[PDB]
Amino acid sequence: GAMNSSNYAELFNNDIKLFVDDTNVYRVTVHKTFEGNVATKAINGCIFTLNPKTGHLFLKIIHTSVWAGQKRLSQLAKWKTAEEVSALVRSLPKEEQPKQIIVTRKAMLDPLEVHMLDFPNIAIRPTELRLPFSAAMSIDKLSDVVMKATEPQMVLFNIYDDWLDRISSYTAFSRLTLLLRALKTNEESAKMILLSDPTITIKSYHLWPSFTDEQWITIESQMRDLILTEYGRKYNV
Amino acid sequence: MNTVPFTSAPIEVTIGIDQYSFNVKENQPFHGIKDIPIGHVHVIHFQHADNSSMRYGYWFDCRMGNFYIQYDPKDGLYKMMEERDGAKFENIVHNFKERQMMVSYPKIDEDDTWYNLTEFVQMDKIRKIVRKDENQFSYVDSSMTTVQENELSDPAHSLNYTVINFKSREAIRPGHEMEDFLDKSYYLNTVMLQGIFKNSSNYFGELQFAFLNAMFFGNYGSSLQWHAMIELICSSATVPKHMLDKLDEILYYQIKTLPEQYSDILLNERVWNICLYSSFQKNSLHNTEKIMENKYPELL
Ligand SMILES: O[C@H](COc1ccccc1Br)CN1CCCC1
């Protein structure tokens, strides 16, 4: 059933699962037209599909050409998301296919379920969690790649860089979501936090700096304080 | 005019005949129902005075035999039976009419209610849904489940309605996933009408029997079928204009005939607010929309 604060450790068991967030599939800028009306222009997006256990993140770049001549685009995005997830699943060998797929927005249950009918033994689940994966486009190199894309294209990598070599997947996921949730509440600050020290570099194939364990703690604390802070500034508490 | 005599009424029971019903008191002299219109299917059903649990009934057609009711005290219930000896049968009936121990099917002449509710209902189809082929009549009760319900336990005592499932491969063609699901014309027109039902009338009969089984026995799977078969049409952008016009009448009489106080279990909020106000056919059920809003505005 639904994924929530209780059945939370099920993410880290050995059942192959993926999360799917579609929030950045269909993105636009709103602008004025010469005649004073409003119009949307669309920009590249991205289906965020994440194996929370291994750290595998298969980005599916959505090129604005996919929309051309289409109506009800916010609705089609969800169908297109599920078309792309299905196609991913179908390309993996049997023993690598996920047993569950959890969507971050209940709107994706039907599109997906329909697209997956061929895979009756794959459970499609919602979640009750407020998860911050939409901030994924606040991670610099990902913003440049999705934007620089000229055609549909899929990136294969790991979203925890090399962390698992020293920490477990539960902790790895918790660090991910903290940084994401901070990037969402106050991107400028959250990013200022991550880069203040110019000697701690980001590797060629990494999103996060090459912190030490000691350094990760400072950072995590600071992102805590930030998320607690940025709440106050809002609710004046 | 035809007749369903009773051997007797040993137990207090409420008897149903089509949309009518009357109280019979334990060992009152009652011997059945006369003047039953020839030309339509009918349903005699029963609710014992003790165990309001389990409404049960038999569908039948006087064209297909002489039928009588006989209470069976091992099994506890009024049983329908066919009399093969036609002469024996006329004799008994005449005996009971002369003594006047039969109530009369009480139809008003202006009233097309029963016809409208059974326009496309045909015994042969019912007997394919309630498989019990040694009997020319077909037994149904509250607790019977549907084939689709036994897939989500005894298969002989099931209601074998046509399986409709919007999130199935039958419903959904490869590569048209979003198209087929948001607009079920394919499913409706080719899979179901051309494929399984053949014509609109068979579809509508299943739909009318589903509804009557729901209303007379509160059979829950029947109700789900009814709303299912409604929903498919309303969710299809391409329907024959004649089928839309007949549906609107079909639903009108159903809604007209429903007990005001049974409405809250038998009308599915989602399906109706979708059909009437969201689906492709929101504008196409004028009679159905008018009576729903004047009678059950609370549901909307
Ligand atoms: O393209 C990669 C860097 O980008 C990523 C790195 C790891 C995971 C995902 C991405 Br996308 C190589 N280059 C170094 C910096 C510029 C790009």
XYZ file of C-alpha atoms and ligand atoms in Angstrom:
554
model
C 0.000 0.000 0.000
C 0.996 3.626 0.442
C 4.554 4.433 1.520
C 4.791 6.554 4.699
C 6.814 7.293 7.858
C 6.015 3.848 9.278
C 6.984 1.462 6.479
C 10.012 3.612 5.763
C 12.814 1.110 6.163
C 11.304 -0.962 3.352
C 13.263 1.287 0.976
C 16.479 -0.276 2.154
C 15.628 -3.939 2.024
C 16.864 -6.052 -0.802
C 13.663 -5.783 -2.877
C 14.448 -3.948 -6.073
C 12.338 -0.784 -6.048
C 12.299 2.527 -7.924
C 10.893 5.887 -7.030
C 9.458 8.026 -9.938
C 9.000 11.769 -9.591
C 7.422 13.532 -12.585
C 7.395 17.114 -11.271
C 10.070 18.343 -13.749
C 8.861 16.486 -16.820
C 6.855 19.438 -18.152
C 8.371 22.861 -17.475
C 7.562 26.277 -18.823
C 8.291 29.956 -18.490
C 5.258 32.233 -18.535
C 5.727 35.512 -20.482
C 3.772 38.328 -22.059
C 3.027 38.365 -25.785
C 3.286 41.349 -28.046
C -0.526 41.772 -27.992
C -0.463 41.810 -24.118
C -1.696 38.246 -23.656
C 0.160 35.575 -21.705
C 1.858 32.534 -23.296
C 3.921 29.592 -22.144
C 7.225 28.584 -23.663
C 8.445 25.111 -22.681
C 11.945 24.029 -21.614
C 13.699 20.633 -21.345
C 12.579 18.400 -18.498
C 13.453 15.182 -16.808
C 11.877 12.173 -15.210
C 13.737 11.488 -11.914
C 13.828 7.722 -11.401
C 15.801 6.623 -8.288
C 16.802 3.195 -6.798
C 17.029 4.463 -3.158
C 19.006 1.350 -2.180
C 21.987 1.260 -4.641
C 21.934 5.014 -5.419
C 21.286 4.352 -9.114
C 19.526 7.347 -10.731
C 18.425 6.995 -14.382
C 17.553 10.545 -15.580
C 15.263 10.555 -18.732
C 15.710 13.976 -20.401
C 12.499 15.261 -21.924
C 13.173 17.407 -24.991
C 10.687 20.192 -25.675
C 10.048 18.670 -29.182
C 7.951 15.932 -27.487
C 5.192 18.489 -26.815
C 4.935 20.062 -30.288
C 1.371 20.093 -31.504
C 0.092 18.387 -28.320
C -2.872 19.490 -26.201
C -3.347 19.131 -22.420
C 0.346 18.872 -21.821
C 0.300 18.558 -18.051
C -1.860 15.533 -18.633
C 0.312 14.070 -21.374
C 3.492 14.491 -19.240
C 2.138 11.880 -16.751
C 1.334 9.478 -19.654
C 4.793 10.208 -21.146
C 6.444 9.670 -17.753
C 4.794 6.298 -17.492
C 5.627 5.476 -21.101
C 9.300 6.140 -20.368
C 9.346 4.256 -17.023
C 7.736 1.193 -18.702
C 10.253 1.349 -21.508
C 13.079 1.468 -18.913
C 11.666 -1.489 -17.047
C 11.304 -3.435 -20.275
C 14.939 -2.950 -21.153
C 16.255 -4.231 -17.996
C 16.893 -8.006 -17.663
C 14.253 -9.825 -15.605
C 16.376 -10.178 -12.481
C 17.022 -6.403 -12.461
C 13.412 -5.279 -12.889
C 11.910 -3.634 -9.827
C 9.300 -5.371 -7.740
C 7.798 -2.025 -6.691
C 7.556 1.405 -8.267
C 6.586 4.227 -5.936
C 5.351 7.491 -7.478
C 5.710 10.733 -5.622
C 2.360 12.119 -6.864
C -0.883 10.124 -6.899
C -1.653 11.453 -10.384
C 0.987 8.925 -11.763
C -0.769 5.791 -10.400
C -3.215 5.376 -13.315
C -0.803 6.318 -16.174
C 1.757 3.962 -14.856
C -0.602 1.176 -13.961
C -2.004 1.203 -17.467
C 1.476 1.249 -18.983
C 2.627 -1.613 -16.835
C -0.269 -4.033 -17.301
C 2.327 -6.333 -18.988
C 4.134 -6.553 -15.627
C 1.381 -7.717 -13.266
C 3.854 -8.761 -10.620
C 5.190 -5.135 -10.252
C 3.350 -3.187 -7.537
C 2.733 0.492 -8.211
C 2.674 2.421 -5.010
C 1.886 5.992 -3.861
C 3.506 7.594 -0.853
C 2.318 9.915 1.926
C 5.766 11.558 2.090
C 6.505 15.198 1.144
C 9.705 14.083 -0.626
C 11.917 16.839 -2.129
C 13.079 15.245 -5.353
C 11.705 18.195 -7.420
C 14.744 20.183 -6.209
C 16.855 17.848 -8.243
C 17.178 20.571 -10.921
C 18.919 22.726 -8.294
C 21.925 20.384 -8.568
C 24.122 22.522 -10.988
C 25.550 19.876 -13.463
C 22.065 18.295 -13.845
C 20.614 21.763 -14.681
C 23.310 22.212 -17.404
C 22.836 18.703 -18.944
C 19.004 18.733 -19.156
C 19.218 22.293 -20.551
C 22.045 21.551 -23.041
C 20.155 18.527 -24.377
C 19.202 18.760 -28.041
C 17.361 15.421 -28.321
C 15.764 12.890 -26.002
C 18.551 11.271 -23.955
C 18.967 9.048 -20.791
C 21.836 9.525 -18.223
C 22.876 6.397 -16.092
C 24.892 7.210 -12.811
C 24.640 6.929 -8.906
C 23.050 9.949 -6.944
C 24.933 9.195 -3.711
C 28.447 9.641 -5.565
C 30.638 7.212 -3.493
C 29.068 7.544 -0.113
C 27.973 3.894 0.149
C 31.667 2.978 0.389
C 31.505 4.360 3.943
C 27.810 4.639 4.901
C 24.641 2.561 4.620
C 21.785 3.238 2.183
C 19.433 4.436 4.898
C 21.919 7.133 5.914
C 22.807 7.830 2.294
C 19.118 8.437 1.456
C 18.666 10.628 4.556
C 21.593 12.811 3.536
C 20.175 13.048 0.032
C 16.782 14.189 1.188
C 18.199 16.664 3.674
C 20.288 18.390 1.051
C 17.396 18.277 -1.413
C 14.933 19.589 1.140
C 17.346 22.440 1.970
C 17.938 23.190 -1.666
C 14.139 23.537 -2.027
C 13.551 25.801 0.942
C 16.348 28.289 0.223
C 18.458 27.292 -2.712
C 20.832 30.264 -2.551
C 21.786 29.584 1.082
C 21.846 25.801 0.785
C 24.250 26.210 -2.138
C 26.288 28.814 -0.252
C 26.599 26.224 2.492
C 27.884 23.542 0.189
C 30.576 25.585 -1.540
C 31.950 28.051 1.035
C 35.277 26.195 1.341
C 36.950 26.406 -2.092
C 39.386 23.559 -1.415
C 36.723 20.820 -1.132
C 36.192 19.963 -4.787
C 33.441 18.101 -6.634
C 34.738 15.127 -8.719
C 34.156 14.802 -12.490
C 31.344 12.189 -11.950
C 29.987 13.595 -8.608
C 27.165 16.038 -7.663
C 28.092 16.458 -3.983
C 31.765 17.770 -2.763
C 34.325 15.226 -1.648
C 33.702 15.801 2.075
C 35.250 13.778 4.872
C 33.001 12.051 7.399
C 33.871 14.849 9.855
C 33.000 17.448 7.238
C 29.705 15.744 6.336
C 28.530 16.300 9.912
C 29.161 20.026 9.902
C 27.319 20.229 6.595
C 24.371 18.083 7.688
C 23.997 20.177 10.874
C 24.115 23.421 8.874
C 21.410 22.152 6.512
C 19.348 21.215 9.581
C 19.660 24.714 11.023
C 18.777 26.088 7.589
C 15.609 24.035 7.179
C 14.576 24.906 10.732
C 15.514 28.539 10.049
C 13.791 28.977 6.697
C 10.662 27.668 8.421
C 10.724 30.461 10.992
C 11.241 33.245 8.455
C 8.004 31.953 6.919
C 5.726 31.314 9.884
C 7.271 34.092 12.054
C 7.813 31.746 15.009
C -52.367 -13.684 -18.865
C -50.583 -16.498 -16.979
C -50.362 -17.873 -13.507
C -47.877 -18.896 -10.844
C -49.841 -20.957 -8.275
C -48.507 -21.810 -4.827
C -48.985 -25.096 -3.060
C -49.333 -23.065 0.116
C -47.813 -20.397 2.297
C -46.583 -22.195 5.427
C -44.425 -19.266 6.642
C -45.020 -15.540 6.958
C -43.289 -13.980 3.961
C -43.243 -10.819 1.918
C -43.785 -11.813 -1.726
C -42.363 -9.766 -4.605
C -43.619 -9.958 -8.185
C -41.825 -7.544 -10.549
C -42.038 -4.100 -8.832
C -44.989 -5.086 -6.611
C -45.140 -6.896 -3.284
C -47.677 -7.893 -0.627
C -47.622 -9.476 2.827
C -48.673 -13.058 3.371
C -49.432 -14.242 6.916
C -48.400 -17.679 8.136
C -50.924 -20.260 6.864
C -53.218 -17.701 5.362
C -55.057 -19.400 2.474
C -52.897 -18.139 -0.429
C -52.381 -19.899 -3.632
C -50.360 -17.692 -5.935
C -50.540 -14.931 -8.519
C -52.726 -14.577 -11.607
C -53.113 -12.254 -14.648
C -49.347 -12.049 -15.115
C -48.730 -10.249 -18.423
C -47.443 -12.479 -21.116
C -44.680 -11.019 -23.170
C -41.915 -10.028 -20.726
C -39.611 -11.827 -18.296
C -40.673 -11.606 -14.674
C -39.245 -12.075 -11.211
C -41.011 -13.528 -8.171
C -38.927 -13.054 -5.040
C -39.249 -13.492 -1.320
C -38.353 -12.052 2.061
C -39.172 -14.233 5.071
C -40.762 -12.529 8.043
C -38.009 -13.811 10.318
C -34.721 -13.492 8.506
C -34.722 -10.217 6.611
C -31.284 -11.505 5.642
C -31.340 -13.041 2.160
C -33.834 -11.794 -0.376
C -34.093 -14.518 -2.994
C -36.048 -14.954 -6.161
C -36.568 -16.621 -9.506
C -36.625 -15.020 -12.902
C -38.874 -16.626 -15.459
C -41.126 -16.353 -18.505
C -44.523 -17.980 -18.619
C -43.846 -18.679 -22.275
C -41.313 -21.325 -21.270
C -43.379 -23.624 -19.079
C -45.942 -23.950 -16.383
C -44.283 -22.885 -13.144
C -45.444 -23.060 -9.525
C -44.047 -22.259 -6.061
C -43.808 -24.892 -3.336
C -42.364 -24.289 0.140
C -39.689 -26.880 1.006
C -39.253 -27.377 4.766
C -35.932 -29.321 4.704
C -34.280 -26.456 2.788
C -36.407 -23.645 4.296
C -37.514 -21.746 1.278
C -40.175 -21.195 -1.278
C -39.084 -23.148 -4.360
C -40.054 -22.632 -7.988
C -40.851 -25.765 -9.979
C -42.025 -26.696 -13.450
C -45.111 -28.846 -13.933
C -44.688 -31.044 -16.978
C -48.341 -32.270 -17.084
C -50.073 -29.332 -18.731
C -53.542 -30.743 -18.137
C -52.858 -31.269 -14.437
C -51.766 -27.641 -14.335
C -54.761 -25.932 -15.954
C -56.934 -28.041 -13.649
C -55.260 -26.814 -10.443
C -55.214 -23.160 -11.610
C -58.912 -23.237 -12.520
C -59.663 -24.829 -9.177
C -57.869 -21.891 -7.435
C -59.406 -19.128 -9.535
C -62.903 -20.416 -8.883
C -62.239 -20.400 -5.142
C -60.493 -17.026 -5.634
C -57.396 -17.787 -3.577
C -55.121 -15.951 -6.057
C -54.078 -12.314 -5.951
C -54.029 -10.477 -9.319
C -50.876 -8.943 -10.909
C -52.008 -5.405 -10.318
C -50.950 -3.467 -13.426
C -52.311 -0.002 -14.195
C -52.983 0.380 -17.894
C -51.087 3.677 -18.309
C -48.044 2.075 -16.692
C -45.102 0.948 -18.869
C -42.774 0.724 -15.862
C -42.017 -2.991 -16.082
C -41.682 -3.000 -19.777
C -39.336 -0.085 -19.707
C -37.224 -1.815 -17.132
C -37.056 -5.078 -19.019
C -37.128 -3.848 -22.613
C -34.024 -5.836 -23.659
C -34.110 -8.583 -20.979
C -34.439 -12.086 -22.440
C -34.653 -15.357 -20.501
C -32.052 -17.068 -22.631
C -29.453 -14.503 -21.725
C -30.299 -14.656 -18.055
C -29.743 -18.420 -18.168
C -26.228 -17.900 -19.503
C -25.506 -15.621 -16.508
C -27.174 -17.893 -13.928
C -26.067 -21.275 -15.199
C -28.522 -23.900 -13.925
C -29.676 -25.410 -17.148
C -31.917 -28.184 -15.799
C -34.348 -25.398 -14.869
C -36.099 -23.056 -17.296
C -36.152 -20.450 -14.527
C -33.139 -18.867 -12.787
C -32.505 -18.421 -9.067
C -30.803 -15.357 -7.551
C -30.309 -14.046 -4.064
C -28.643 -11.340 -2.014
C -25.440 -13.199 -1.230
C -24.547 -14.487 -4.717
C -21.224 -13.196 -5.994
C -19.948 -12.530 -9.475
C -17.277 -14.226 -11.546
C -15.273 -10.985 -11.357
C -15.837 -11.034 -7.596
C -14.544 -14.647 -7.336
C -11.339 -13.488 -9.067
C -10.613 -10.721 -6.526
C -15.548 -19.091 -4.281
C -18.151 -21.568 -5.556
C -18.366 -21.127 -9.358
C -21.779 -22.756 -9.971
C -23.644 -20.347 -7.645
C -22.080 -17.239 -9.209
C -23.412 -14.438 -11.386
C -21.478 -14.812 -14.678
C -21.777 -11.229 -15.830
C -19.499 -9.986 -18.608
C -16.136 -8.971 -17.173
C -15.485 -5.244 -17.706
C -12.183 -3.856 -16.411
C -10.925 -0.455 -17.466
C -7.293 -1.205 -16.519
C -6.922 -4.420 -18.514
C -5.201 -5.455 -21.717
C -8.583 -6.073 -23.297
C -9.570 -2.491 -22.537
C -6.224 -1.055 -23.471
C -4.375 -1.377 -26.755
C -0.565 -1.272 -26.864
C 0.742 2.134 -27.784
C -2.694 3.780 -27.268
C -2.491 3.500 -23.458
C -3.464 7.046 -22.690
C -5.833 7.206 -25.650
C -7.734 4.001 -24.935
C -8.038 4.683 -21.144
C -9.258 8.238 -21.291
C -11.638 7.446 -24.203
C -13.033 3.893 -24.019
C -14.677 3.910 -27.465
C -12.357 1.088 -28.593
C -13.217 -1.004 -25.569
C -16.880 -0.142 -25.829
C -17.427 -0.424 -29.581
C -15.047 -3.048 -30.904
C -14.083 -5.190 -27.908
C -17.499 -5.338 -26.198
C -20.275 -4.430 -28.662
C -18.775 -5.988 -31.812
C -16.719 -8.586 -29.937
C -18.724 -9.935 -27.025
C -22.299 -8.562 -27.086
C -22.913 -8.408 -30.889
C -25.525 -5.633 -30.621
C -26.625 -2.846 -28.322
C -29.661 -4.775 -27.114
C -27.771 -7.643 -25.473
C -25.550 -5.068 -23.774
C -28.611 -3.203 -22.487
C -30.288 -6.449 -21.288
C -27.268 -7.389 -19.155
C -27.341 -3.857 -17.941
C -31.070 -4.005 -17.031
C -30.758 -7.394 -15.242
C -27.665 -6.223 -13.341
C -29.742 -3.274 -12.084
C -32.873 -5.283 -11.142
C -30.790 -7.897 -9.308
C -29.209 -5.026 -7.420
C -32.526 -3.334 -6.577
C -34.577 -6.383 -5.760
C -31.992 -8.362 -3.802
C -29.327 -5.783 -3.097
C -26.903 -7.986 -4.897
C -23.701 -6.021 -4.608
C -21.805 -7.447 -7.591
C -24.863 -6.764 -9.794
C -24.853 -3.105 -8.737
C -21.110 -2.941 -9.613
C -21.844 -4.407 -13.081
C -24.622 -1.881 -13.572
C -22.383 1.031 -12.739
C -19.627 -0.504 -14.772
C -21.705 -0.819 -17.935
C -23.059 2.708 -17.538
C -19.543 4.004 -16.936
C -18.071 2.496 -20.118
C -20.611 4.275 -22.308
C -20.288 7.632 -20.578
C -16.510 7.379 -20.806
C -16.577 6.714 -24.581
C -16.464 9.688 -26.905
C -17.940 7.823 -29.857
C -21.328 6.238 -29.248
C -24.159 5.521 -31.731
C -26.649 8.344 -31.295
C -29.403 5.758 -30.927
C -27.642 3.999 -28.048
C -27.293 7.278 -26.171
C -30.985 8.011 -26.545
C -31.977 4.563 -25.372
C -29.602 4.669 -22.414
C -31.118 7.941 -21.207
C -34.586 6.277 -21.141
C -33.197 3.118 -19.542
C -31.563 5.028 -16.703
C -34.585 7.299 -16.343
C -36.944 4.427 -15.352
C -34.317 2.844 -13.119
C -33.891 6.095 -11.247
C -37.628 6.582 -11.324
C -38.295 3.108 -9.888
C -35.682 3.204 -7.132
C -36.856 3.432 -3.484
C -35.917 6.880 -2.225
C -34.549 5.292 0.988
C -32.379 2.675 -0.720
C -30.617 5.302 -2.827
C -27.525 5.709 -0.603
C -26.157 2.169 -1.115
C -27.144 1.648 -4.745
C -26.000 4.860 -6.425
C -22.308 5.375 -6.776
C -21.455 9.053 -6.248
C -18.326 8.934 -8.395
C -19.847 7.186 -11.401
C -22.890 9.427 -11.664
C -21.155 12.769 -11.024
C -18.657 11.593 -13.626
C -21.236 10.424 -16.171
C -23.502 13.441 -15.800
C -20.982 16.227 -15.339
C -17.478 15.085 -16.497
C -17.684 12.322 -19.083
C -18.046 12.775 -22.826
C -21.819 12.152 -22.503
C -22.455 14.820 -19.794
C -24.842 16.561 -22.224
C -26.425 13.437 -23.602
C -28.623 12.205 -20.696
C -31.170 14.955 -20.458
C -33.949 12.866 -18.903
C -31.502 11.076 -16.610
C -29.870 14.321 -15.479
C -33.223 16.026 -14.795
C -34.673 13.262 -12.628
C -31.365 12.693 -10.746
C -31.074 16.372 -9.803
C -34.762 16.743 -8.777
C -34.833 13.515 -6.694
C -31.268 12.926 -5.385
C -29.619 16.362 -5.445
C -27.746 15.367 -2.268
C -25.697 12.873 -4.209
C -24.492 15.701 -6.481
O 28.986 15.023 -17.251
C 29.627 14.658 -16.103
C 29.312 15.488 -14.824
O 27.931 15.430 -14.650
C 27.437 14.411 -13.913
C 28.242 13.755 -13.145
C 27.773 12.675 -12.463
C 26.517 12.351 -12.543
C 25.676 13.044 -13.294
C 26.161 14.037 -13.989
Br 25.057 14.755 -15.181
C 31.047 14.974 -16.464
N 31.315 16.453 -16.507
C 32.105 16.969 -15.331
C 31.502 18.334 -15.053
C 30.719 18.723 -16.316
C 30.148 17.408 -16.759
